[PDB]
Structures are given as structure tokens and as C-alpha cells.
RNA sequence: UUUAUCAUUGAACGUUCAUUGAACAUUGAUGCAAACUCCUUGGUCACACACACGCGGAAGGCGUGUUUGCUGACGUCCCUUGUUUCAAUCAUUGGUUAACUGAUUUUUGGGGCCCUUUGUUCUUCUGAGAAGUGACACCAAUUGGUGUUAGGGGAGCUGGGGCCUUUCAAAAUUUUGGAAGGUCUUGGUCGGGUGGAUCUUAUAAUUUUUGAUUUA
């Protein structure tokens, strides 16, 4: 009879197809739904291994080497700039092949995301009801830009480089604009 | 009512699974919607024949009796329906 | 006949180390006795070819740590039924165990 | 690199830098054991440090090459992508796509300039520079001389001036002997 | 206990693969609990073509899968 | 393969173990099952299939068996195209190891229903 | 009236089982289910002179080094076709089926 | 080792070529191995290194005892957490004739092992110390969600087992049962239209258990 929602922790009084259909789209759903998920990700990567780590039983160990420590702010500081690239370098794509292709006489039916007939009757369907209040599509041809280079494109966008090697780059290019 | 494993179909809605058939064919793509008898609905199907062929499919409904087995995505391993211990928070009166 | 030495004790309890003796040395007696002070020691006894396989030994155990040979003191029971009376031989060190 | 320098600093077993490369090599050239009986703490850190300066050196490198890359050449071309033999190319581009062509066979990495000429080939598909631009290129340094002819069929197969591909398609296959052609 | 959300295919035309290599193409008139299908225009391809006449119904187990090859 | 599996155990005691449960087709789905229910829907845990091919189906007539293996990770099987399952590995964490989890899950549960109530409050 | 009781009587009592398929089991009983999943605890099973799908099913089960001797199994009741029971128990014994005694009194 | 479409028409001597129409992969696939490299796990325990014929781990079986006939939800203190061993100093307690021996605690120092404790350690802070046992950690937009709040040792108390002593009863000095004390070892610190679990019944008719997977 009744539905026990795990994420909302709320109850359906009598379980039916429309009531769950319903539920299972409802946005508070959706919401604890999505924290949970991420809880649990961020919860297994967080977690330490932690393994037994048999410690076996054996002269030459002469030398010995300085162990490097950190303060406790400087621990707590360098784990959340850590934190923060992780979750940089997951959530980045690389743009480039739109940002190259812009002109293009088949751009707008093959990089515009849903024209593309493969994906494409997905981001219609997969589009959310927009109850609540407040596309270049393949009409495009060749004539519509003739001449690119008449209506000024932006440059290529310069290389991105890590800040961390930041400072040894090569000073003073050659050829300034 | 359920029971686990069909509440678990019941989860992992609109994401990609691949189901075995009785026949052999091994149907991959997204779960529109799944119900209680295992019916469940796919969407942009991609199928492999039992004489080695792949075709896609748009838009499939596969009947839950002919299902070889289903494959869900991995990370429903870590699922609220696995907690045994989860206590109810006082039944609707 | 041979008694091998450090052959990792805590292998098995009575059959299964016999099998896994037999197992790396790929016989007709392989003694191994459970009691404390023959922990890591083991007998095998085939005397003239026995003594030609002990010469061909460089044997490593299944367990890991190499096991080294070395001649029997005495013998085992098997050599003693081969030159084979034996039965008061029993008898009498049966009776300097108790003693 | 930052998927690389991140992956450094998971690695934490020192096994695997066995895995990361080849042990000999690792041993010989940066001095670190992987098979070690001391307590692998400190010794796992300055293994990872010193590797970061490797790491440094070879950045440097890829990014000084890179940095030239686009500053010269990347930072000019603006049209990649063959919109239809009717449309025209700037001059200042084209002055940059031949010296892009002329940067890239200096380096000799093959592979990198027939993508770089196949690549410049986009946008300038017919114009009958970069094709006769290809077939001097072939037959001068590579030296195949009968690749040249078979790029050269195959702008004459569209450079709207077939005049000089013309030509330059007679004498490379004069000097082919395939007089029947 | 539940009756499938064929709901979407409800005058589409759909071609189910009928127990191993009988498939049928036709439009979806009805469904009821267990998936036995009425078609209309049932026109079954062989791999030729037979057709099956005006209307058809299809036994939810003989019934392996159909799909909409009209679009939705 | 040594296990010793419970002689008084059945599927609910069975759970977390790693099974080698055996369909009408002969395929062998191995993983560790994590729920079953009335009709023996399993699930099953980063779970292999494995066949064996008709080829090789020769020399296991009355040896080594190339198996063929594709890895169905989280799986969940059904009720209805199996035939018998058994037990393969023994669970990673042991008895005092499980029951100290369940107190520790249960604590954690009373925990949260505790919380459940201060914020009804 | 269902004879699932009649097997619920049967624990630790040492059957053979003839499946569906054609795979022969021998090994006690340590429970049966309501639908007759039995669960058998020291089996060998046997496959009698052949068929392909039961030569994998044999085989894959583990310990097939053609008897297959494995700790434990559980058997799905519709894959159970036939089950031999031991002849020394008595079946004047056990099917007399308290719930149908009571039932008649019931009556 | 094998395989890499069919149909129709024309031509040449079943084949080859051409045209037309219809519908993954050869570096594969299948068989036989063999070797290297890599991966994860485990008491790399305690003892000992020798000439026979140990405690605490993990998994199952059997026996005894308690408790309940389903389960649980709803309406203690202190010390330490790098560890271990050795010497010295001091305190207390016991014995023997101020001296000696033993035990415990504190301090100092040395040796070994380990620090992958990878963030150099139950949580926070500082560069081992300090504080705490609702708090902390963190993701989304003050709110919502998940995880953690530990481990070891000792004492008090309590449960169980084993031994010994005493008393009482029964049977023919012995056996059994009960009680008490001491010693050792191990463990802990009433209701309900509530839900869940198991089993019955709908339920042997198309969707998992009352058969269409021995390929005839
Ligand atoms: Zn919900």
C-alpha cells in the first residue's frame, strides 16, 4: 500500500502508476535526490582506505631522509584548494571545436546540440515543464554569413597555462600585436 | 507489494541500461520508464541481434517476461533500498 | 632417507602438507609431525637414489623461504622395514619413549 | 598536465612508479628504488617531488613550443573550416597560413605537417597556393616525387586555377616516365 | 495488476518482434493488462511481405518487443 | 574451493556473500548478491558472466576451459531464467566485523529518528 | 493440501534430485522453501550419459574435478522435477499432515 | 584453420567480367599453448632454528545452559593512543634479619621496531601540546542531504564456564542436585487502525514456482 520515498523520507498513502510518475519527476525529489547521489560520491572519495598493512620482518638502510609536515591551517587550506581543483577537472570540457567551427554552413545542425537527429529528439523530449514564469537552427545556409572576416569574429582564445608554473613562461614574446 | 530488486528498476530511471533478452539480443540505452511487472521502456536503443548484427532502435518497449537480466549503472550499488536499518518516520495515519 | 628444514610449519595439519610438499618437489615417506620441537622439519625418505636427489639440491618452499636438505641421523621406519625383529625394535623404543 | 600532475599525486604506493616508468630507467637517470625497506614516508615524498621537477622541464618544453605555436601563427587564423569555393580568404591570412607550412617542415615530424598541410587544405582548399605549396614540398625534401603527383591529381581535382597545377602535374609526371598517362 | 504505459504508442505505428523472427508491423489499437495488443493493418515482414488484414490481436506472450516506427 | 559454507544458512544469511548462481541457459553470473525477494530476482554485485563457447563445450566432454567472460558489474537478475546457485567466496568483512556494522548502523538510524523528531519539534 | 509440508518434514534427511534439465544431485536436504526451493548442504552431482546446456552447468559450478562435488547448493523449485526420497523413512508416517487433521476437525 | 552477400539481365570459355535492385569487424574470428610484466588479498604473529615416526584470529559441525516464541523501532569511572625492552632515582605495600628481595606508579636516558600515521594520526586548533565527547567535516540553494563521534587497558558491578572447600537431601566410602565463599578465563556496562520479517490463502492459466531450453 504505501510507498516509502527513501530519499524524501515521506510516505505515498496508496501507491498507483500517476502518483509515483508524479513524485518521481516532483523537483523536491529531484533535489534530495541529487544531494544524496553527490553525498555518497563525495562521502566514497572522501573516505581513507585505511588498509592493514602487514608489516613484514627483514643494514644497508644508512641513509635517511627529512619527512615534511604541515601546520594544521596549512593542511585544512591546502586540502580545500585540492578539493576545488578535483572538482575543477571533472566538471571541464574542452569547447574548442564549436568556438572553431562558428561559421560553418552545417554548424547550426551538427554542434547546436538537438539537430543533430541522433541526440536529438532527446533535449525536446528531455526539456523540464516550464510551469512556473520566465536556437540556430538549420534555416542557416551559406549566405547567411558570406564573409566571415567582414563582421569582426574574436581572435582564438590565447592557451590556458598552470598557475603554478605561471612564472616560468618565456618573458618578452616575440612580436607584439 | 515490490520487494527490492523491482524498486531498484523502480530507481534508476532515465539512465543507460542494458537488458538481455531470452533470445540473446542485448538491448543498451535509456530507461524511460520501467513498472512494477518489468515492463520497461527504452530510449535511443541500440540492439545486438543473436547473429551478431547491432541496429539502432529510437524507441523500445521490451516485455518484462523475455528480460535475460538488466544491468543498471554502477553507482546504485550505494542505494537507500540497500539500508537495513533505515527506521520509518512514523507511517501516514 | 632426508629431513628437510624450514619448511613452514603453519602450512597444514596433517595431509594437505604432504600435498603441498610433494606438490613443489614434483616418494614413499614424507613424515611431518604437529609437535613443537619438530615444527619446521620434515622427513622424506625414499637410500642410494634418495641420496642421489638430495645431491641434485637450491629447493624453495611453496610457503616462500628456501628449505634447506640434509642426511637423516638415524632413519625412518620405512628404511627399517626395507632392510627388513623390527617389531621388538618397535617394541623397545616404544618403551624408552614412555621412559 | 594537470590530469598528470594530479595523478603524481595520488600515486602513493611507490610501486607504481614502476608504472609510471620503466624501473631501470627510473633508477639510472632519477635515483629512486622501488623495492626499499625503510619506512616510506619521506622517501615517498621526495620521490614525488623529485618527479615534479622532471615533470617541470618537460612542461617547459611543450609549453615554450606551444607558446610559440600560437603566438606566431594561431593567434592569425581566424577560418578553419571550408565554407564553399565561392567564399574568399584574406591576404594577411593567407601570409600566415604559408608560413604556418613553412614552420612545420622544419620540424620533420611527418605526421604533423601532411595533418598541417591536409589541415591548411580546409580553408584554402582551391586556390592552388598550398597544393603546389604540397607537391615542391614533396618532391624537394621527402622525396617520394611520386606523392606529389598523386596531391597534385587531387587539387587539380579542384583548384580553380588549374593553370599552374597544370604545368606542375606535366613535369612531375615527365620526371615520372608515365608517358602513357 | 498495473496496465502498460503504451499510452504514447497509441497511434503510432509500432512493429513488434513476435516470439523470435515473426515480425509485425501495424498501429496500436489496444492493450490491455497483459500486453495483448490489438493492430491494425498488421503487416508482417519477412526478411516476402505478408499482409494480415484489416484488424489483428496478438498474444502478450507470444509478444517479445515492439517498437514506434513512427516518430513521438 | 574450501569455503565451508553455513550448513543451517539460506539467502538472507547468505547476504553480501559472493555467489556463482547458474541460469537455464548455462551461463554462470558470479557477484556478490546484495538483496533477492519472493520470486528470486537477484542482484548481484559487480558481477562476470561467463559461458563457455560451443567450441570449447567440445573438450569439456568426458582439462582447461576458456571460459568466456564479459563483466556485467551491477546486474540484476531474474527469478524466472535461472536454475541454482551456490556460495564462492566468503564476505570481505567477517562475523564481529558485520555485527559490530549493524550496531553501528542502528545506532546511527536511532540517531537520525532522533533528529526527525527535533525538528518536528 | 500441498505436499511443500510433506518436504518441510524432511531436514537432514538425504535425498537425490532429478532436475529438470537432467542433473542428478545427491546430498541432504537442510530446508525446502514454500514454492520448493530446496537448499542442499554436501552434494556430488552427476550427469547421466549427453546434454550440452547441463555439461555447462555442470562444469561451471565450481570443483567439477563427471561428479561434481560442492558444498551448497540451492535449488529453484521449478527446476526440481523429481526427488528421490530415502527408502528406509516410513511415508505412513509423514503423511498424515497435522494441519489436515486439524482441518477435519476444523470441519 | 576457416569465412568475409543474394537475385535478374548481357558477353566470353560451372567460372569470370559488366549493369540493375535488396540487406560490426581481418591487424579479425576459432583452436593450442607458453612466457614476461602488473594487480588485490594474507598472523610475512608468539615462541623457538632444534633429529622425529602457545595464546589471542577466520570459517563450519556437535554438546550444554539461559531466554523468547518473530524482530527491533513508536507511545559508569579513570589512564593512554607511536609501541616494546633495559638501567638509574624517588614514593607506597608485603616478607625476612637500618639492610635485602618482589610488585606498582612517576621521571630521566639508551637500544630496537615503526611512523604508508601518505593530512605525520575520535573531532577541532597550534608547531608533541591544548579543548570537547550536541559537535565536526563537506555538496547544493540560513535551509536541505550524508558520514563520523573511535580503539586499547584497568577497576567497580553484572552474566557464563572450570576447579576447590563447607553444609543439606536422596541412592547403594562413592555418585547426583541445590546453596554459599575463594581462584582462574571470556562478554557487557504495558499499549498500538504502527511498520517490517517469515508462513498460509487468493495464486497451478499471458509476467519470476506448478515446465515449450536433454534439440527430436
Ligand atoms: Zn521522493
Known amino acids: 500500500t504505501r510507498y516509502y520515498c527513501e530519499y524524501c523520507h515521506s510516505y505515498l498513502t496508496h501507491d498507483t502508476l500517476s502518483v509515483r510518475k508524479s513524485h518521481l519527476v ?83 545542425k551538427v554542434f547546436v546540440d538537438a539537430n543533430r537527429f541522433d541526440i536529438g529528439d532527446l533535449v525536446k523530449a528531455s526539456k523540464l515543464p516550464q510551469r512556473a514564469n520566465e536556437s540556430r537552427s538549420r534555416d542557416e545556409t551559406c549566405e547567411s554569413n558570406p564573409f566571415p572576416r567582414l563582421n569582426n569574429p574574436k581572435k582564438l582564445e590565447p592557451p590556458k597555462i598552470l598557475s603554478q608554473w605561471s612564472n616560468t613562461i618565456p618573458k618578452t614574446s616575440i612580436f607584439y600585436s | 507489494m515490490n520487494g527490492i530488486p523491482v524498486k531498484l528498476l523502480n530507481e534508476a530511471q532515465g ?31 541500440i540492439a545486438t541481434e543473436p547473429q551478431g548484427a547491432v541496429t539502432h532502435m529510437d524507441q523500445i518497449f521490451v516485455r518484462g517476461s523475455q528480460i535475460k537480466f538488466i544491468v543498471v549503472p554502477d553507482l546504485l550499488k550505494n542505494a537507500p533500498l540497500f539500508k537495513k536499518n533505515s527506521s520509518r518516520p512514523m507511517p501516514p495515519i | ?47 642410494e637414489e634418495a641420496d642421489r636427489f638430495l645431491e641434485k639440491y637450491t629447493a624453495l618452499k611453496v610457503q616462500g623461504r628456501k628449505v634447506r636438505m640434509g642426511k637423516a641421523r638415524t632413519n625412518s621406519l620405512l628404511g627399517x622395514x626395507x632392510x627388513x625383529x623390527x617389531x621388538x625394535x618397535x617394541x623397545x623404543x616404544x618403551x624408552x619413549x614412555x621412559x | 598536465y594537470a590530469l598528470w600532475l594530479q595523478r603524481i599525486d595520488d600515486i602513493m604506493d611507490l610501486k607504481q612508479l614502476s608504472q609510471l616508468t620503466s624501473k631501470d630507467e627510473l ?51 581566424y577560418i578553419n573550416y571550408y565554407t564553399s569555393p ?27 605537417t601532411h595533418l598541417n598541410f591536409q589541415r591548411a587544405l580546409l ?22 616525387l611520386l606523392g606529389a603527383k598523386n596531391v597534385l591529381l587531387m587539387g587539380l581535382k579542384f583548384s580553380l586555377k588549374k593553370t599552374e597545377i597544370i604545368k606542375l602535374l606535366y613535369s612531375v609526371i615527365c620526371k615520372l616516365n608515365e608517358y602513357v598517362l | 495488476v498495473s496496465t502498460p504505459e503504451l499510452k504514447k504508442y497509441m497511434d503510432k505505428k509500432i512493429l513488434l518482434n513476435i516470439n523470435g523472427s515473426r515480425k509485425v508491423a501495424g498501429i496500436l489499437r489496444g492493450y490491455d493488462i497483459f500486453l495483448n495488443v490489438v493492430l491494425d493493418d498488421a ?24 517498437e514506434a516506427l513512427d516518430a513521438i | 574451493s574450501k569455503i ?35 520470486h528470486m530476482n537477484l542482484v548481484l554485485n559487480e558481477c562476470i558472466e561467463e559461458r563457455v563457447p560451443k567450441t570449447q563445450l567440445d573438450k569439456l566432454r568426458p582439462l582447461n576451459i576458456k571460459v568466456e567472460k564479459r563483466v556485467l558489474g551491477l546486474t540484476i537478475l531474474r527469478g524466472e531464467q535461472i536454475l541454482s546457485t551456490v556460495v564462492e567466496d566468503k564476505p570481505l568483512l567477517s562475523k564481529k566485523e558485520r555485527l559490530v556494522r549493524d550496531k553501528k548502523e542502528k545506532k546511527q538510524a536511532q540517531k537520525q529518528t532522533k533528529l526527525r523528531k527535533e525538528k518536528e519539534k | 493440501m500441498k505436499l511443500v509440508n510433506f518436504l518441510k518434514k524432511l531436514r537432514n534427511e538425504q535425498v537425490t534430485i532429478e532436475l529438470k534439465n537432467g542433473t542428478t544431485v545427491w546430498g541432504t536436504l537442510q530446508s525446502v522453501s514454500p514454492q520448493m526451493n530446496a537448499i542442499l548442504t554436501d552434494v556430488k552431482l552427476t550427469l547421466p550419459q549427453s546434454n550440452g546446456i547441463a555439461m555447462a552447468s555442470l562444469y561451471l559450478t565450481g570443483g567439477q574435478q563427471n561428479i561434481a562435488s560442492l558444498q551448497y547448493i540451492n535449488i529453484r523449485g521449478n527446476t526440481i522435477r523429481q526427488i528421490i526420497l530415502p527408502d528406509s523413512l516410513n511415508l505412513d508416517s509423514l503423511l498424515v499432515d497435522q494441519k489436515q487433521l486439524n482441518s477435519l476437525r476444523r470441519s
Open chain 2, 15 to 45: 539512465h543507460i541500461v542494458s537488458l538481455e533478452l531470452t533470445t540473446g539480443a542485448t538491448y543498451r540505452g535509456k530507461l524511460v520508464e520501467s513498472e512494477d511487472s518489468m515492463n520497461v521502456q527504452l530510449r535511443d536503443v
Open chain 6, 4 to 38: 565451508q559454507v553455513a550448513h543451517s544458512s539460506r539467502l538472507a544469511n547468505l547476504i553480501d556473500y559472493k555467489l556463482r548462481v547458474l541460469t537455464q541457459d548455462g551461463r554462470v553470473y558470479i557477484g556478490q548478491l546484495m538483496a533477492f525477494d519472493k
Open chain 1, 26 to 108: 516532483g523537483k523536491n525529489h529531484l533535489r534530495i535526490t541529487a544531494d544524496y547521489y553527490r553525498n555518497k560520491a563525495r562521502d566514497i572519495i572522501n573516505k581513507h582506505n585505511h588498509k592493514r598493512r602487514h608489516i613484514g620482518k627483514r643494514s644497508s638502510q644508512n641513509e635517511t631522509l627529512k619527512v615534511t609536515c604541515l601546520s594544521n591551517k596549512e593542511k585544512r587550506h591546502i586540502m580545500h584548494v585540492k578539493k576545488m581543483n578535483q572538482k575543477e577537472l571533472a566538471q571541464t570540457s574542452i569547447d574548442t571545436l564549436k568556438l572553431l567551427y562558428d561559421g560553418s554552413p552545417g554548424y547550426s
Open chain 5, 43 to 66: 503487416m508482417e515482414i519477412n526478411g516476402n511481405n505478408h499482409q494480415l488484414g484489416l484488424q489483428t490481436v496478438i498474444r502478450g506472450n507470444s509478444i517479445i518487443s515492439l
Open chain 4, 123 to 144: 580553408p584554402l582548399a582551391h586556390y592552388d597556393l598550398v597544393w603546389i605549396k604540397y607537391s615542391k614540398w614533396l618532391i624537394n625534401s621527402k622525396n617520394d
Open chain 4, 27 to 77: 633508477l639510472k637517470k632519477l635515483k629512486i628504488d622501488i623495492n626499499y625497506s625503510g619506512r616510506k614516508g619521506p622517501y615517498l615524498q621526495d620521490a614525488k617531488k623529485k618527479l615534479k621537477k622532471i615533470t617541470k622541464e618537460m612542461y617547459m618544453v611543450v609549453q615554450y613550443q606551444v607558446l610559440e605555436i600560437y603566438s606566431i601563427f594561431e593567434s592569425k587564423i
Open chain 4, 86 to 112: 565561392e567564399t574568399l580568404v584574406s591576404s594577411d591570412e593567407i601570409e600566415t597560413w604559408i608560413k604556418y607550412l613553412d614552420y612545420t617542415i622544419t620540424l620533420q615530424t611527418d605526421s604533423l
Open chain 3, 1 to 47: 632417507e632426508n629431513y628437510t628444514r624450514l619448511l613452514l610449519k603453519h602450512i597444514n595439519p596433517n595431509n594437505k602438507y604432504a600435498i603441498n610438499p610433494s606438490l613443489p618437489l614434483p616418494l614413499l615417506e614424507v613424515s611431518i609431525s604437529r609437535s613443537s620441537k619438530m615444527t619446521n622439519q620434515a622427513f622424506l625418505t625414499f637410500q
